[PDB]
Amino acid sequence: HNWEMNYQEAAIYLQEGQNNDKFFTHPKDARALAAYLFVHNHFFYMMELLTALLLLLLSLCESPAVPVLKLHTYVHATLELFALMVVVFELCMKLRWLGFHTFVRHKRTMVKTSVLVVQFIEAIVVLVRQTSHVRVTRALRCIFLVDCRYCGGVRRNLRQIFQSLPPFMDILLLLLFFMIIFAILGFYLFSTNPSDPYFSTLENSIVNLFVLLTTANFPDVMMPSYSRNPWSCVFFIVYLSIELYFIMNLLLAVVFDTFNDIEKHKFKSLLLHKRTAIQHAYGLLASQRRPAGISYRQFEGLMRFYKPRMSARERFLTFKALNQSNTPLLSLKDFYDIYEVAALQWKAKRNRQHWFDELPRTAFLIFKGINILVNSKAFQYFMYLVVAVNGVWILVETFMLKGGNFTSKHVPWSYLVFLTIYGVELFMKVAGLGPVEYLSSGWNLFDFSVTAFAFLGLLALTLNMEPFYFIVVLRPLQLLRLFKLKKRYRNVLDTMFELLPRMASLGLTLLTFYYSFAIVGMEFFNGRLTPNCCNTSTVADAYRFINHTVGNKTKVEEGYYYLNNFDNILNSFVTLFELTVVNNWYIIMEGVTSQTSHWSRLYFMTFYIVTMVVMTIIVAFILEAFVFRMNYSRKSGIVIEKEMSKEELMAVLELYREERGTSSDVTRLLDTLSQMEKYQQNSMVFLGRRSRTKSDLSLKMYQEEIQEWYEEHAREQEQQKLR
Amino acid sequence: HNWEMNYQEAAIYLQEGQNNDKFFTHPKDARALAAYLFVHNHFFYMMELLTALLLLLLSLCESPAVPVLKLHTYVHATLELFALMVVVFELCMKLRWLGFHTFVRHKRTMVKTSVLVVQFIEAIVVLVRQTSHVRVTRALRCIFLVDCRYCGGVRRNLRQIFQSLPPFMDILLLLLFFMIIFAILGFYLFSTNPSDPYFSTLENSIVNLFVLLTTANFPDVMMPSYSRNPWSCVFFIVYLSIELYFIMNLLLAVVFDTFNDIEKHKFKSLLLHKRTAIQHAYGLLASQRRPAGISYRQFEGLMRFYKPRMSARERFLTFKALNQSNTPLLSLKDFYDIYEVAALQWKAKRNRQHWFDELPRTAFLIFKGINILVNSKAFQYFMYLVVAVNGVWILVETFMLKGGNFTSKHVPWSYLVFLTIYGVELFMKVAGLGPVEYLSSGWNLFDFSVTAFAFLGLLALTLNMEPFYFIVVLRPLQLLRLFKLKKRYRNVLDTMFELLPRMASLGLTLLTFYYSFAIVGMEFFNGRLTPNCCNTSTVADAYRFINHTVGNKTKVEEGYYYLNNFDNILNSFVTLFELTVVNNWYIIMEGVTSQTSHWSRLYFMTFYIVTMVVMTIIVAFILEAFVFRMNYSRKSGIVIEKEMSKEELMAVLELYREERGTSSDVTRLLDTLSQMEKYQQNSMVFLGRRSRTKSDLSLKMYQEEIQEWYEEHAREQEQQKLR
Ligand SMILES: CCCCCCCC(=O)OC[C@H](COP(=O)(O)O[C@@H]1[C@H](O)[C@H](OP(=O)(O)O)[C@@H](O)[C@H](OP(=O)(O)O)[C@H]1O)OC(=O)CCCCCCC
């Protein structure tokens, strides 16, 4: 009962190194062991995520409501109380695992408890008083989704944005200084003209030069001055040159470069925190004998507690992939690579087909015939020729019918001809190659998806479900097969499906900024923007709704900007998307400040600066990884190839018979005894594979400075171990 | 007469290495020597620049004319003929220096000759027919300003933009594909509504989605669809996410990264071309004796032909700065650094003041008193306190008079008080420190400039020149002294005045693109945009001019976009500046295509793509140098310090007395004999200094990969010298 506890403890060191969890709270007794095992399941993590996500989606039914998803007050009050009681349960369990003095000194959980208390109080107050009072405190509910376990990549990306901020504030102050001094000069220089609303007072000049900084009103702010004297253009050319190009691009460059340094040091601390965890494990399950290493028995002991649900054959394969020195041990120089070998799935190599050992003759020659045709290199060039003729046919047919062919109910017979060609090619390729060897490649999956989508649209249209005619409209997506002919598109699309979870983990951070601004925007600008209001401002042309009664036609004209409300969480989300895309944001701004005070100008200006810093950091960081991996693809997942013999299995099998483990492991090794006998051979070659994570790109980016990190790390450990 | 020709030839090798000129055309005979000396003066270079710049400014008087600078047809025809005859003179002289077979095989001069012939022909045709016909061929006159000698940094920056182009065209084709396929889907999906002009035909959908790619009409193109069904926002969110953010930022990232690689290889070829020039010079004027090096006599021979107008004292100082091994020779390892030592100016070190050896007592104690006060560290903190009180006074005074104080004729007496403080501080600092030691620093130059500017505005206002009141309006530029208190602003402003010629050399390339587009735009869209036209389009609201006659006021309302003409070269320059700043470009586009055909849509789309690639490359390249030199300034011109003794001057003086050179050199060395005797010392310490060029930043950027370049270069030379 000793070595199994060493195995459990060493697997805890590896999980605790993976999840970036501090080594002071490593469990020693059985009480802290059971608490650690109670918290770190996948049930508890999914309970955190479902509770937090239900709370954010509970904001969809509260007091500014989508009118069909509206509940009464006591219903969503008690749902809010129930979800907060689940959060109390989770903080009690983490308080059970960690100590009290470790719990209090961790700042994120303490802020989470204070937000928990305030949300609990106003939930009870809304439950008693029967009416929702203000509810601005909802905007702090992003901390329940950030502080979970699956959203670590969101939490770190927010923290590094707020840590990139002190170089931003300095040059921002340099920006606002020149903006004010050109507002003073502009007020003196252009206010005597009675024919402009722009430079009339001081706040009109300061607001209009802040909007001109975003270039949202550039010709319109210059024209009443440019009509009087044509030398008034010098003011705006000098202003845009100094302020926009030089200073604002200097601002974004400085913020992004401190963001890269902060990420580089965060990745450094993550590698070094993994490395000490491996060193504690090797300290725990070494031999302490005349050889210094790890035997196969202890490595079996790691893999039966770290990464369970794993075959004994796969376990032996990972051991031989870690050996690398051909002695029956593991040194630290070869045990420093657990995380990148224990994460790969092992497959055998079989050269037979999946339709030949089952059927007899005279269809055996058929499936041989289809395999020869589908792997002939003339069938491929023929199919590219079919795609090219299809595209030229579509283009000439749009020049014939003047683009009017995309409105009729009548399916062209040419569409039926090409759909039969891609269909027959789909059956011949999926049968002559095998459906396992068909869904392997991504392009075959794309062609199957598009062609089966077009059969669905064709069948639904002959079923007279006319809203499914847009599938018939999307014909030229079949021309997207033609892009694998060029090399650079293969690089772009492979990198696009490699960097996809990282892009989702950054879009979620941008959605957190939208969520807090949308809740403040709902509770203060709820019922202001109506049709045909704001007629005392300069934006009366845009909030208008005029009927006419010529004939019996009741033709209406309207300016449509009364639809950018803050009535719901959904109308406010599409409004904040219209403010991220920078154009015409001053119209929504000055409509709201026509109805409310001027401090709502302060709202929209703050949202502009926040969304611009966040958007440049997200786009630049993703595209730096994107360009690096394309150029690396022109410098040259990963595939390892190892093998075993039957002589290397005689040592393995009697150990499982002697130690008396489970039964499925033993019978698995009996099955590979049979598979060695059927082919009449001893040495059998296996094949390992795993998909690229973001840490592999981060190792290839910073490759020239990693050994320096490990040397400085070992020196720091010698400072602690000499003391 | 032998060694002087070796000196002349070696100085030609160093000039030919500096100017990036090929070594096949090195002159051998006296004929090619006199031709090389006739071409490479500073008179010939300034003749090239003045001819080309007069030709581009001759386009200001031609047939679309600024109406006050308008000439007749024969006057500017003969000016065009005279300037082209000067260009014929220059090509005849370069044909005199280079061979014929070298002249023909150089592509830039051959294109320059063909443009010379065509411009010569249509100049004669305009001179005969008395009316200007079309004159689109003017747009190729940028090649006369690019192909000169002072505009090498413009020529290289244009060439690398056109060499960055094949990765651009590929992803641009990927952009236009998804734009068309969403135009087909959008035409099907939103055309049945009678209340929108956007998706009505096919060309309206393709044009409006190309404009939506620039985000110039984003809310307005969505709103008539978003009013019908609110789920129509999914189309535009998916379109902007895939097309704008991902693909367009991928486009700009790929173009900028190939631009950096092209610049890296161009800088590599420039260093290696300098290095072979130094190797030819060391081959030419070595000893060929028992020591292998360069004596002082031959190094005097270089400096009397390379870098003339140089003292013999400065010549000896550069030799001792090149020695670095304390033997009377120069090896190649210390002669590889000519260009960075021969470019620095040498000064002595003197600790006396400039107002003490002239005046007697009782004012000697006065100027001592002002020096002690101006260097006291309490006078400085006092002056910062004066600036801070001045700024708080300005802010509170704008809150008092509601910003209305910037309109009155009355000068505030507070302005007179602070102006007397800065004036007295200016005289006390410029007298207590010395005007040579006052104009050294940049901030003192700034404070002198601002304060003397304010005396000029005050004196002109008491002279009742009321248009000089804007100097009184620009009070808060005196608050810009307060920014040297923080470290990061000192870094930003020092880097801004270091990277300034490079920024001018990139703005000139952007002006060449404006020039060619402005000439095509003048000759095809001359008299189209009038007041109150284009009333059949959707932009009738913007080209309008309506009078009213209420009372006797004749108040007018107008839409002002008829002022963005193409009538002149100046109206077209401010119009193209309004198209670089992206906002509201489709209004100018659809006004022009209301008057002309649809191929002018093809004009404005091409100009958008060109100006976007050029603007991102310019901004990103400058800001990469900017951030690198700020972070390098937190890692740690250049200053060298060498000395000589009188014993080291006894060797120098008798060589100039024996060889019998000039007289001013000998008398200069007699003057430093006197300056050594007056202080009663032998060793005297001198001080060298030069300002940072762009090649020093380029050496510090690529520092980790330069020795690899020199090794590969030496291997290439051994491949040629073994054969
Ligand atoms: C406006 C907020 C600006 C925040 C900008 C400052 C952000 C900031 O530096 O974190 C410092 C701490 C939070 O820091 P905190 O997150 O509590 O603690 C860190 C995490 O534990 C991190 O784990 P993961 O990141 O999950 O992997 C760990 O690696 C770090 O250890 P290390 O140092 O050895 O690397 C810890 O220092 O304190 C707060 O920030 C409280 C936040 C309360 C929020 C209040 C308002 C909602």
Ligand SMILES: CCCCCCCC(=O)OC[C@H](COP(=O)(O)O[C@@H]1[C@H](O)[C@H](OP(=O)(O)O)[C@@H](O)[C@H](OP(=O)(O)O)[C@H]1O)OC(=O)CCCCCCC
């Ligand atoms: C639309 C034009 C696109 C141009 C994009 C291609 C530009 C391009 O690659 O240069 C190739 C040559 C010009 O090349 P060209 O300039 O004539 O010749 C180069 C220069 O002499 C350069 O000196 P500097 O640049 O002054 O320092 C030198 O270093 C290079 O030698 P190296 O290789 O050993 O380094 C030469 O190859 O040919 C043309 O380009 C003719 C241009 C006529 C313009 C016609 C229309 C106005």
Ligand SMILES: *[C@@H]1O[C@H](CO)[C@@H](O[C@@H]2O[C@H](CO)[C@@H](O)[C@H](O)[C@H]2NC(C)=O)[C@H](O)[C@H]1NC(C)=O
């Ligand atoms: C601008 O809109 C306001 C609505 O807030 C208009 O005020 C109303 O005018 C009508 C008749 O003109 C009156 O019957 C209402 O009582 C007014 N409402 C209020 C709250 O006073 C105003 O007339 C409009 N101004 C225009 C069109 O110039």
Ligand SMILES: *[C@@H]1O[C@H](CO)[C@@H](O[C@@H]2O[C@H](CO)[C@@H](O)[C@H](O)[C@H]2NC(C)=O)[C@H](O)[C@H]1NC(C)=O
């Ligand atoms: C649109 O503009 C055209 C100008 O091209 C106007 O046509 C002119 O109309 C006036 C009187 O309506 C006639 O005297 C002119 O002879 C017309 N010009 C031409 C060239 O025929 C037209 O009226 C305008 N339409 C509007 C304002 O609805």
Ligand SMILES: *[C@@H]1O[C@H](CO)[C@@H](O)[C@H](O)[C@H]1NC(C)=O
């Ligand atoms: C316009 O007419 C509709 C009915 O056709 C009516 O409901 C609406 O209130 C009218 N809008 C006005 C008068 O502003």
Ligand SMILES: *[C@@H]1O[C@H](CO)[C@@H](O)[C@H](O)[C@H]1NC(C)=O
């Ligand atoms: C408007 O009135 C001015 C005179 O004040 C006149 O010159 C101009 O032509 C008028 N514009 C019209 C009638 O469109």
